[PDB]
Homo-oligomer: A and B are copies of this chain.
């Protein structure tokens, strides 16, 4: 797919919210644990994603996530326009005992996912570099 398309979804585990961003063309994931599934957390996360990768268009399985003016302001400032969460949840379960906090197990699970094989981490850099 196009190199600037990202998928953004909020999932739940242990009573906390896990925001999962997926680079559609590569399978590359960035994920964070947020306290609440609010528009302010989504806006701030989008600003972070956009500063690290060339984010052009964002998709979601729950359109209502993108309705807050807060989110829309983040998309506006960064120039952003408008399946996988089980694989990551699978990895999280496997490594969960290796960490006290869920946020730590998530980052461990993002590490494993992006580096297993090319790997998602290798694909995204190639796709983005090729487009450059």
**What residues of B have a CB within 8 angstroms of the CB of A47 in the complex?**
104, 107-108, 111
Contact B126 A44 (CB under 8 A): no
In the complex, A122 Cα to B3 Cα: how many Å? 13
In the complex, A128 Cα to B132 Cα: how many Å? 13
A13 interface hit (Cβ, 8 Å):
no
**What residues of B have a CB within 8 angstroms of the CB of A84 in the complex?**
none
A1 interface hit (Cβ, 8 Å):
no
CB distance from A7 to the nearest CB of B (A): 17
**What residues of B have a CB within 8 angstroms of the CB of A104 in the complex?**
44, 47
Residues of A within 8 A of B (CB): 30, 44, 47-48, 50-54, 77-78, 103-104, 107-108, 110-111, 113-115, 121-122, 125-126, 128-130, 132
Other than the given A47-B111, A51-B111, 10 more pairs (CB < 8 A) read A44-B103, A48-B110, A51-B108, A52-B110, A54-B121, A77-B108, A78-B111, A125-B132, A128-B129, A129-B129
